[PDB]
Write a protein that binds this ligand. Sequence first.
Ligand SMILES: CCOC(=O)/C=C/c1c[nH]c2ccc(OCc3ccccc3)cc12
Length: 209
Amino acid sequence: WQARGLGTARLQLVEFSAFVEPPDAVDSYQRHLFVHISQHPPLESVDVRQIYDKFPEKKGGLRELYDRGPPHAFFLVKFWADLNWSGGFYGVSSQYESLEHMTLTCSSKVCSFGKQVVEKVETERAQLEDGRFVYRLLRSPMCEYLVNFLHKLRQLPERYMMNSVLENFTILQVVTNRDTQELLLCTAYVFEVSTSERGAQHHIYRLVR
Ligand SMILES: CCOC(=O)/C=C/c1c[nH]c2ccc(OCc3ccccc3)cc12
C-alpha cells in the first residue's frame, strides 16, 4: 500500500508554494514562485537515516517523530529553488484535503545546520466542500528570517556557493490532528538552487527505514 503522491489516506497535499509579489503587482499582477508543489507509480524511497543529522534531535526531530509513526506519513521533498526574481510581499500557501473532518495543527520548523532556528505553528479548521473537507492556509506572510535569508542568498556570486549554504538549510513540516495529537503528514525539505532559465522544480520521496 505504497504512496504515489505526497499524502496519506487521511490527509493529502493539494498545493504548496512560497512566492513573492513585487510592489508593481497592484498595477500589473505577477508573482514569483521560489518553490511550488501542485497535485491536481509509487514514489522513490529514501532511507530516513541518511538525513538524521540535517534535522532537530531531542523532541520533534526527524528520528523521534519517525519513532512515533505512522511511518507511511513521512516524505522527503527536494527543491530546486528559483532564486532569480526590494520591498514586496513574501508569502507561503498550503492546502490539504481529507475524507474526515479534523482540526489540523501545522508546524514549520526552519533549521540551519539542524538547529531549530525559527518555528511557526498554525491551526486550520476543516471547511466542507464538494463531498470532502478542505484545509486552506493561503498567503501566510513569510517569517522575516526566511525573507532576509533569501536576499542574502540571492546576492552570493556563484551557484555552487548558493548550494553550499543551502546544504545546511532544511525545513521540517509536521501536520497533526489538533484534537487527537496523532501525526498525519511529516515532510523534510532539502534545498538546492535552480539555474534560473529553469524555474523551480522538485522531487518527492517516501521516507523509509
Ligand atoms: C508561513 C510562515 O512560515 C514560513 O515563513 C514558511 C514555512 C514553510 C513551510 N514549508 C516550507 C517550504 C519551503 C519554504 O521556503 C522555500 C525556500 C527556502 C529556501 C530557499 C528558497 C526557497 C518555506 C516553508
